[PDB]
Design a protein around this ligand. Structure first.
Ligand SMILES: [Ca+2]
Ligand SMILES: [Cl-]
Length: 496
C-alpha cells in the first residue's frame, strides 16, 4: 500500500484537478512522460450530483450518485483510454475515491446526475448502485442533528454526516463489497492506486476491511503481487482525538501540517524563518516520511476551503509558491504531489472569497479543453503549474537526486539557506530582504552547471544562470532579493 508503483526514477504525481480524460491522456504522452512525471491524480471518475445552484461547483464531484464512470471529465471508454495510454508511457493514474458518503441529504430527488441516474436522498435511494436506507449510518449516528457537531468525539466524526453528506455504513459487508466492486473495476482497468477521500470520517478498521477485498494491480503493466498505492486524506493538525497514525496500517496519509508550516515559514509569519527548516520533517512533529504524502496546497485549501487556512501558498502567490514547491521537491521528506489548477474569479469579501465554489473553465457547463500555447503554457484558464519551468525543472531535480542524503546545509540565521542532496544536487534560497552573495560547499563534482530555475540546459549551453563548481566542490552564489525567482538549483543532469 505504501509504494506509489511509479516507474523507477519518477518521484512525483500531479493533481490534474477537473481535467477531462482525453486531455490527461494527451498530456501523458506529450508532456508528463517525457518530463519525467510519475503519475496523475484524477478527479472522482464516478457519477455525481449535477448542481446548478451554484452553477456546477467543483465540490459537486464529492457527492456521489452511483459508481458509473460517467462525469464531466468523460465516460467509461474515455477513462479507460486515458489509463491505457498513460500506462503505456509509464505514467500512473491515481483515482480520487469518494467512499465515505453519497450526496447531501437535502439534495432533491430526480435525475440531476452527471449520467442521468435516478436517486432520492430523502428516502436514501440510489438504485444505480444500489443502496437503500439500510446502507447508511442514520440509525448509528447519535447527534441531535444527525450531522457531525463536535470533532472532539471521534465516534460521531465517523458515524455522522459530514455537513449533511449521507454516511455509508462501512461496517456492513454489502456496502464494503459494493465499494470494492467499484475499486476493483478501476484496478483491473489499470489504475495504480487511490486517494481515499474523507478518511478521517471512516474507521481505520472499516477502511482496512475494504482494502482486503482489493485486487493486485493489472499484471499486464505491473509486476505480480503489486498492491495499489493508498494515501488517505486525514486532516490532522494539532489536538484532535483522531490521529493520522491510526491509519498507518492501511497506507500513507496526507500530511497537512507540511504545507501549513511551509506557508507560515516562507511568509515569515510570527517570527518564523527559513533557517528553522534545518530539521524539517519528523523533527517538526510530522508523520514518518515513509507514510507521508506531501504537497504545498491541495484543491481544498488553495481556495480557503481547508487545512492550513490563510498561510497556504498557491499559484496566486506565484513568486513564493515557486520557492515553496522548490524546497518541497528538493527535500527528501515524503512522497511529493504537485498541484495543477484553473483560475477562477477570486472575490474577497470580509476576508473571504465568495467565489470559492466556481468549477473548472467551461462553456455552458461543458468543461473546456486544455489548450497549449507556443511557450508551453496553457490557455482556457488552466494554470498548469506543472508546466512552469521552475516547477517542472524541480520535478526533474527530485528524480535525479532520488536516494541521495540531505547534506551540506547552510543558513545565515535568517532566511538564506542552502543544502545539497549527496553529490547529485544543490539548492540555494534567498528569502531575506537583502542580497545573498557567498561561496558555498556544494558537494558536487567540479564543472559548469546550468541553474534550472532561471533557465535550462539546451544543447551544451545554459539559457539562464551558470554556476561554476571548483575542484573542492565550492561555488559562488549571488541572488538578489529583487530576483524574479530568489533561489538557484543545479544538479548532475544540468551539468555542462
Ligand atoms: Ca463516515
Ligand atoms: Cl488531499
Amino acid at each position: 500500500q505504501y509504494s506509489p508503483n511509479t516507474q523507477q526514477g519518477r518521484t512525483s504525481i500531479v493533481h490534474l484537478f477537473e481535467w477531462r480524460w482525453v486531455d490527461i491522456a494527451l498530456e501523458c504522452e506529450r508532456y508528463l512522460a517525457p518530463k519525467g512525471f510519475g503519475g496523475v491524480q484524477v478527479s472522482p471518475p464516478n457519477e455525481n450530483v449535477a448542481i446548478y445552484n451554484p452553477f456546477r461547483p467543483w465540490w459537486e464531484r464529492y457527492q456521489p450518485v452511483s459508481y458509473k464512470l460517467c462525469t464531466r471529465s468523460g465516460n467509461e471508454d474515455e477513462f479507460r483510454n486515458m489509463v491505457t495510454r498513460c500506462n503505456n508511457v509509464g505514467v500512473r493514474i491515481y483515482v480520487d475515491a469518494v467512499i465515505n458518503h453519497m450526496c447531501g441529504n437535502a439534495v432533491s430527488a430526480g435525475t440531476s446526475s452527471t449520467c442521468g441516474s435516478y436517486f432520492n436522498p430523502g428516502s436514501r435511494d440510489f438504485p444505480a448502485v444500489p443502496y437503500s436506507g439500510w446502507d447508511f449510518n442514520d440509525g448509528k449516528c447519535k447527534t441531535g442533528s444527525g450531522d457531525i457537531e463536535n470533532y472532539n468525539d471521534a465516534t460521531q466524526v465517523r458515524d455522522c454526516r459530514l455537513t449533511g453528506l449521507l454516511d455509508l455504513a462501512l461496517e456492513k459487508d454489502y456496502v464494503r463489497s459494493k465499494i470494492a466492486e467499484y475499486m476493483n473495476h478501476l484496478i483491473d482497468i489499470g489504475v495504480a492506486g487511490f486517494r481515499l477521500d474523507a478518511s478521517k470520517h471512516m474507521w481505520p478498521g472499516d477502511i482496512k476491511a475494504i482494502l482486503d477485498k482489493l485486487h493486485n494491480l493489472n499484471s499486464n503493466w505491473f509486476p505480480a503481487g503489486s498492491k495499489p498505492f493508498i494515501y488517505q486524506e486525514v486532516i490532522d493538525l494539532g489536538g484532535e482525538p483522531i490521529k493520522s497514525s491510526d491509519y498507518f496500517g492501511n497506507g500513507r496519509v496526507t500530511e497537512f501540517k507540511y504545507g501549513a508550516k511551509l506557508g507560515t515559514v516562507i511568509r515569515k509569519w510570527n517570527g518564523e524563518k527559513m533557517s528553522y527548516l534545518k530539521n524539517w520533517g519528523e523533527g517538526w512533529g510530522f508523520v514518518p516520511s515513509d507514510r507521508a504524502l506531501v504537497f504545498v496546497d491541495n484543491h481544498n485549501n488553495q481556495r480557503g476551503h481547508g487545512a492550513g487556512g490563510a498561510s497556504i501558498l498557491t499559484f496566486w502567490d506565484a513568486r513564493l509558491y515557486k520557492m515553496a514547491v522548490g524546497f518541497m521537491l528538493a527535500h527528501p521528506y515524503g512522497f511529493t504531489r504537485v498541484m495543477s489548477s484553473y483560475r477562477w474569479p477570486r472575490q474577497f469579501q470580509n476576508g473571504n472569497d465568495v467565489n470559492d465554489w466556481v468549477g473548472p473553465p467551461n462553456n455552458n457547463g461543458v468543461i473546456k479543453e486544455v489548450t497549449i500555447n507556443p511557450d508551453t503554457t496553457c490557455g482556457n484558464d488552466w494554470v498548469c503549474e506543472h508546466r512552469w519551468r521552475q516547477i517542472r525543472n524541480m520535478v526533474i531535480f527530485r528524480n535525479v537526486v532520488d536516494g541521495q542524503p540531505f547534506t551540506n546545509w547552510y543558513d545565515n540565521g535568517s532566511n538564506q539557506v542552502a543544502f545539497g542532496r549527496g553529490n547529485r544536487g544543490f539548492i540555494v534560497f534567498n528569502n531575506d530582504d537583502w542580497s545573498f552573495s557567498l561561496t558555498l560547499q556544494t558537494g558536487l563534482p567540479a564543472g559548469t552547471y546550468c541553474d534550472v530555475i532561471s533557465g535550462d540546459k539546451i544543447n551544451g549551453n545554459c539559457t539562464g544562470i551558470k554556476i561554476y563548481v571548483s575542484d573542492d566542490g565550492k561555488a559562488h552564489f549571488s541572488i538578489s532579493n529583487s530576483a524574479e525567482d530568489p533561489f538557484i538549483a543545479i544538479h548532475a543532469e544540468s551539468k555542462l
